[PDB]
Design an enzyme around this catalytic site. Structure first.
Site, mmCIF file in Angstrom:
data_model
loop_
_atom_site.group_PDB
_atom_site.id
_atom_site.type_symbol
_atom_site.label_atom_id
_atom_site.label_comp_id
_atom_site.label_asym_id
_atom_site.label_seq_id
_atom_site.Cartn_x
_atom_site.Cartn_y
_atom_site.Cartn_z
ATOM 1 N N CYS A 92 0.663 -1.172 -0.169
ATOM 2 C CA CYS A 92 0.335 -0.270 -0.078
ATOM 3 C C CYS A 92 1.235 1.214 0.008
ATOM 4 C CB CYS A 92 -0.715 0.604 1.256
ATOM 5 S SG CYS A 92 -2.031 1.443 1.275
ATOM 6 N N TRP A 144 -9.191 5.935 -0.740
ATOM 7 C CA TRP A 144 -9.633 6.759 -2.246
ATOM 8 C C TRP A 144 -8.356 6.329 -3.130
ATOM 9 C CZ3 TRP A 144 -8.924 9.798 2.002
ATOM 10 C CH2 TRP A 144 -7.491 10.478 2.360
HETATM 11 C C1 HEM Z 1 -6.662 6.365 1.361
HETATM 12 C C2 HEM Z 1 -5.767 6.310 0.888
HETATM 13 C C3 HEM Z 1 -5.284 4.899 -0.100
HETATM 14 C C4 HEM Z 1 -4.992 4.685 -1.298
HETATM 15 C C5 HEM Z 1 -4.200 5.873 -2.082
HETATM 16 C C6 HEM Z 1 -3.901 3.501 -1.688
HETATM 17 C C7 HEM Z 1 -3.372 2.853 -2.645
HETATM 18 C C8 HEM Z 1 -3.021 1.667 -2.725
HETATM 19 C C9 HEM Z 1 -2.906 0.786 -3.594
HETATM 20 C C10 HEM Z 1 -2.333 1.765 -5.405
HETATM 21 C C11 HEM Z 1 -2.397 -0.595 -3.944
HETATM 22 C C12 HEM Z 1 -1.332 -1.919 -4.821
HETATM 23 C C13 HEM Z 1 -1.893 -2.803 -5.084
HETATM 24 C C14 HEM Z 1 -2.886 -3.113 -6.159
HETATM 25 O O1 HEM Z 1 -3.060 -1.896 -6.650
HETATM 26 O O2 HEM Z 1 -3.511 -3.774 -6.567
HETATM 27 C C15 HEM Z 1 -2.975 -1.176 -2.345
HETATM 28 C C16 HEM Z 1 -2.263 -2.159 -1.476
HETATM 29 C C17 HEM Z 1 -3.443 -2.443 -0.875
HETATM 30 N N1 HEM Z 1 -3.554 -1.373 0.080
HETATM 31 FE FE1 HEM Z 1 -4.209 1.169 -0.101
HETATM 32 N N2 HEM Z 1 -5.000 2.789 -0.725
HETATM 33 C C18 HEM Z 1 -4.988 3.158 0.310
HETATM 34 C C19 HEM Z 1 -6.306 3.058 1.708
HETATM 35 C C20 HEM Z 1 -6.262 2.015 1.676
HETATM 36 C C21 HEM Z 1 -6.848 1.155 3.190
HETATM 37 C C22 HEM Z 1 -7.774 2.501 3.804
HETATM 38 C C23 HEM Z 1 -6.655 0.348 3.837
HETATM 39 C C24 HEM Z 1 -7.434 -0.999 4.299
HETATM 40 C C25 HEM Z 1 -7.776 -0.267 5.913
HETATM 41 C C26 HEM Z 1 -5.351 -0.095 2.755
HETATM 42 C C27 HEM Z 1 -5.481 -1.381 2.504
HETATM 43 C C28 HEM Z 1 -4.141 -2.089 0.894
HETATM 44 C C29 HEM Z 1 -3.843 -4.087 1.618
HETATM 45 C C30 HEM Z 1 -3.979 -4.571 2.458
HETATM 46 C C31 HEM Z 1 -2.938 -3.447 0.103
HETATM 47 C C32 HEM Z 1 -2.099 -4.563 -0.319
HETATM 48 C C33 HEM Z 1 -2.713 -5.032 -1.487
HETATM 49 C C34 HEM Z 1 -2.680 -6.593 -2.223
HETATM 50 O O3 HEM Z 1 -2.235 -7.268 -0.761
HETATM 51 O O4 HEM Z 1 -2.918 -7.612 -2.945
HETATM 52 N N3 HEM Z 1 -5.114 0.802 1.622
HETATM 53 N N4 HEM Z 1 -2.707 0.401 -1.878
HETATM 54 C C1 LIG Z 2 -8.614 0.400 -0.532
HETATM 55 C C2 LIG Z 2 -7.912 0.990 -1.502
HETATM 56 C C3 LIG Z 2 -7.322 1.935 -1.742
HETATM 57 C C4 LIG Z 2 -6.312 2.301 -3.232
HETATM 58 N N1 LIG Z 2 -5.861 2.881 -3.864
HETATM 59 N N2 LIG Z 2 -7.004 1.409 -4.199
HETATM 60 C C5 LIG Z 2 -7.710 0.193 -4.222
HETATM 61 C C6 LIG Z 2 -8.160 -0.963 -5.046
HETATM 62 C C7 LIG Z 2 -7.166 -1.558 -5.471
HETATM 63 C C8 LIG Z 2 -6.291 -3.085 -3.948
HETATM 64 C C9 LIG Z 2 -5.937 -2.055 -2.827
HETATM 65 F F1 LIG Z 2 -5.705 -1.252 -2.948
HETATM 66 C C10 LIG Z 2 -5.655 -3.769 -2.046
HETATM 67 C C11 LIG Z 2 -6.092 -4.955 -2.386
HETATM 68 C C12 LIG Z 2 -6.637 -5.208 -3.915
HETATM 69 C C13 LIG Z 2 -6.979 -6.368 -3.823
HETATM 70 C C14 LIG Z 2 -6.048 -7.571 -3.304
HETATM 71 C C15 LIG Z 2 -5.091 -6.900 -5.650
HETATM 72 N N3 LIG Z 2 -4.539 -8.239 -5.416
HETATM 73 C C16 LIG Z 2 -4.451 -9.349 -4.819
HETATM 74 C C17 LIG Z 2 -4.219 -8.597 -7.271
HETATM 75 C C18 LIG Z 2 -7.212 -4.342 -4.760
HETATM 76 F F2 LIG Z 2 -7.230 -4.619 -5.609
HETATM 77 C C19 LIG Z 2 -8.433 0.344 -2.423
#
Ligand code: HEM
Ligand SMILES: Cc1cc(N)nc(CCc2c(F)ccc(CCCN(C)C)c2F)c1
Ligand code: HEM
Ligand SMILES: Cc1cc(N)nc(CCc2c(F)ccc(CCCN(C)C)c2F)c1
Ligand SMILES: C[C@H](O)[C@H](O)[C@H]1CNc2nc(N)[nH]c(=O)c2N1
Ligand SMILES: C[C@H](O)[C@H](O)[C@H]1CNc2nc(N)[nH]c(=O)c2N1
Ligand SMILES: [Cl-]
Ligand SMILES: [Cl-]
Ligand SMILES: [Gd]
Ligand SMILES: [Gd]
Ligand SMILES: [Zn+2]
Lengths: 404, 402
Positions: free
Chosen positions: A108, A280
């Protein structure tokens, strides 16, 4: 203690927090598997050991380790598990653990926000009609007329004895994916499977390439039932471009709220299979991955034809040029609609600031370089030149099998 | 129990059985991944040698024959008597190609079989070393129709010091410390630049001054050699439709020739073995010109482009960078100097991955280095999971000789 360098500045730090990493990842001295999306594959004595660890850093985070209720809260959990096999989290522990899971998410890039998180406690929910109402409050609260606020809803923990709350959709808002006679898809190809299960559980299929799917909510044991999201609850942004007047006519939309509803939140050895969290978007998620991936909407060629780009040769960089303008249109459209979004330069710069904070606070930070660096313009962002250490801390969000 | 590797664009799945033969250990453990770090006797010499001779005699489809068993006996005999052994010329050529084939951060390995190997193992002095290098540059440059090549100087041997090329590449631009505390020219080359000056080089004062070679013969101090200007093919940079771009005065050179890595073949070490190919356009346009710690031209270009640099959500950085890359490709094509764009290069690497799966059952690949530094997910390597491990023969990092 690994030495970690920033090549843009020349600065050096040591990741001591990595020493305290537990659930081993996928790599060995002989081969590195960091680039794999899902690493590897997806007597209650072990419950007490993770519960005590989690309780310990909770009282550390409020100074009050040493004497006082810290001594006392260790006993209740010992007794609670000796008598029942599991335990219940105090409301503040559940809040602390929910924020820790987000803080510990190596992939993240938005973790600078990890302290501001709204945690709805839905642990007394006992119905698929009840979940739906929880999910709808969340969506309404998170969306907040476009001024997005991070939020997670925590449904009841898994208990040994048959029973698992679960959402079948990968996100709360997903666009339909319709097969046809070519096998080719109208709509989102990433959602072809769930669009199938939606139809085979009663859903009336729809028009075209931007139909919001219905939710498939699963109270324990009894099978999933379909729920329809009210249109006024699903805020959506039509995509236009500030100077390319024809872009709006492409008919492209995306939704406002990214809400992941298929990961398992794990706090102090407890497992919450339904805990949808939302934040977001960063704009490259929509413009680059969702709309331009070859296995997603795959629009790149069509935008390039409209821009009169020389698609006859890769060396024209027509893909790069078209992709940028898609990202320009995404940022412009969400701004014009007053919907929270963050561009990839702003996000990565805030993550560097998060890295510096965490260095002082915990002596390091788990980060998965391949997911932190944006999918366009990587080396133009400061995280590209930052070395990173990846490792698993608890509390955490984990991947989990699917309910079929 | 072999890593399973998915391509996410298409859904393919393969298993990297070759990773099981990983002949050395990298920086990762199950506790923590360190993949993103840039920088991660007789009986052991014998087992590396025995494994290389086995590879060589497999490639000529002559495994386990008498010729094979003779060479094995020859090597260990020579190791007993001298502490080391000599490669035959055919073994050297094979070893040089395998090291390129085995390099995990190289996106250009579809070409690994087309490598011209110059044998300079009879080199005797710094002056002969210079002559061999000039020949290499002239052959590889080939008036702009670049050819891949490596020159191998004598191996590390007990008794004598090493041949070393002090310069990290055969062609580098000087980087001068300034009054502003700043750097004039390429900031990556400040150190080698100061070395050159204090070894007699008379410095220039431009941003694109080609550096002399500092060449070390065994147990000799480094000796300074100037490159003839007409041996260093350069390309002035212009933009097809931004005509003020030519007035920036930007240049880059034709030949990327890495001169400071150590080539390892069957336990033998070659600390001087410079190799050269042709550029991928993002190395020049994105990294060398746009990195904030390099020429750092991005804001200058964007300001000239009349982009809104007040705010990041106008994406002025991405737009400037794309146009700098366009200028690099246009300029090299106009100069008739070989160059590949990151789309064509990553497409050909994908083909390499498929060729390698059929040949050896896999391919060591460092994802963070294979994916280009702009437009990452628009190329096909982005969605390809990869497995990173160390095979030998190999090019290895080594400490600077100073
Ligand atoms: C507030 C703005 C946030 C932004 C801009 C953001 C952005 C991102 C992005 C770009 C990813 C890349 C993973 C992907 O593209 O599939 C990611 C992963 C992730 N985010 Fe964030 N996120 C936000 C908030 C949160 C929140 C609130 C949570 C949980 C309470 C969270 C939990 C996670 C987790 C667990 C991953 C791991 C994804 C994975 O293992 O596939 N995020 N986030
Ligand atoms: C909370 C939030 C913020 C943001 N900016 N974007 C998202 C969607 C992308 C995203 C995550 F970030 C986190 C987890 C997953 C699912 C796992 C993605 N993997 C396994 C392909 C995801 F698809 C969620
Ligand atoms: C002919 C076309 C070639 C292309 C397009 C190419 C491209 C690249 C690129 C883009 C990288 C990563 C760049 C970086 O370090 O920032 C790289 C790394 C590398 N290349 Fe190639 N290369 C070519 C030829 C060669 C040749 C001829 C050799 C040796 C015989 C070679 C050996 C290597 C090695 C060892 C690395 C690893 C560097 C490291 O570990 O840091 N390459 N190549
Ligand atoms: C032969 C060749 C072709 C090409 N296209 N580019 C280059 C320069 C980049 C490059 C390499 F590729 C390989 C090695 C190095 C030196 C190692 C730098 N490590 C620490 C990032 C290099 F700097 C060389
Ligand atoms: C920290 C990070 O690993 C480092 O800056 C790497 C990332 N990937 C790269 N990839 C290439 N091709 N060249 C580079 O110099 C780098 N730099
Ligand atoms: C193979 C590779 O690990 C995979 O395609 C990853 C790379 N980095 C990513 N980064 C983000 N943010 N999202 C992704 O889906 C991916 N995909
Ligand atoms: Cl998404
Ligand atoms: Cl270079
Ligand atoms: Gd037109
Ligand atoms: Gd013009
Ligand atoms: Zn690793």
């Amino acid at each position: 203690f690994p030495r970690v360098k920033n090549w843009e500045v020349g600065s050096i730090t040591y990741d001591t927090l990595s020493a305290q990493a537990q659930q081993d990842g996928p790599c060995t001295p002989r081969r590195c598997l960091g680039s794999l999306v899902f690493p590897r594959k997806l007597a209650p004595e072990q419950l007490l050991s993770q519960a005590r660890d989690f309780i310990n850093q909770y009282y550390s985070s409020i100074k009050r380790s040493g004497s006082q209720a810290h001594e006392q809260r260790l006993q209740e959990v010992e007794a609670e598990v000796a008598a029942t096999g599991t335990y219940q989290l105090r409301e503040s522990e559940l809040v602390f653990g929910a924020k820790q899971a987000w803080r510990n998410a190596p992939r993240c890039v938005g973790r600078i926000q990890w302290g501001k998180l709204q945690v709805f406690d839905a642990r007394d929910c006992r119905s698929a009609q009840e979940m739906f109402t929880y999910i709808c409050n969340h969506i309404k609260y998170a969306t907040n007329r476009g001024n997005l606020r991070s939020a997670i809803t925590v449904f009841p923990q898994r208990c040994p004895g048959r029973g698992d709350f679960r959402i079948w959709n990968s996100q709360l808002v997903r666009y339909a994916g319709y097969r046809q006679q070519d096998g080719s898809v109208r709509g989102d190809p990433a959602n072809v499977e769930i669009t199938e299960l939606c139809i085979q559980h009663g859903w009336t299929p729809g028009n075209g390439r931007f139909d919001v799917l219905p939710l498939l909510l699963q109270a324990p044991d009894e099978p999933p039932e379909l729920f329809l999201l009210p249109p006024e609850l699903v805020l959506e942004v039509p995509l236009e471009h500030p100077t390319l007047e024809w872009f709006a006519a492409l008919g492209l939309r995306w939704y406002a709220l990214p809400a992941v509803s298929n990961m398992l939140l794990e706090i102090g050895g407890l497992e919450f299979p339904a805990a949808p969290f939302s934040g977001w978007y960063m704009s490259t998620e929509i413009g680059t991955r969702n709309l331009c991936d070859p296995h997603r909407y795959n629009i790149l060629e069509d935008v390039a034809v409209c821009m009169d780009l020389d698609t006859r040769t890769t060396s024209s960089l027509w893909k790069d040029k078209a992709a940028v303008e898609i990202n320009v249109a995404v940022l412009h459209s969400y701004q014009l609609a007053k919907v929270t979004i963050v561009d990839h330069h702003a996000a990565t710069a805030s993550f560097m600031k998060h890295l510096e904070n965490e260095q002082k606070a915990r002596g390091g930070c788990p980060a998965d370089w391949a997911w932190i660096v944006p999918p366009i313009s990587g080396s133009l962002t400061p995280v590209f030149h930052q070395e990173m250490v990846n490792y698993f801390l608890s509390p955490a969000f984990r991947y989990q099998p699917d309910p079929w």
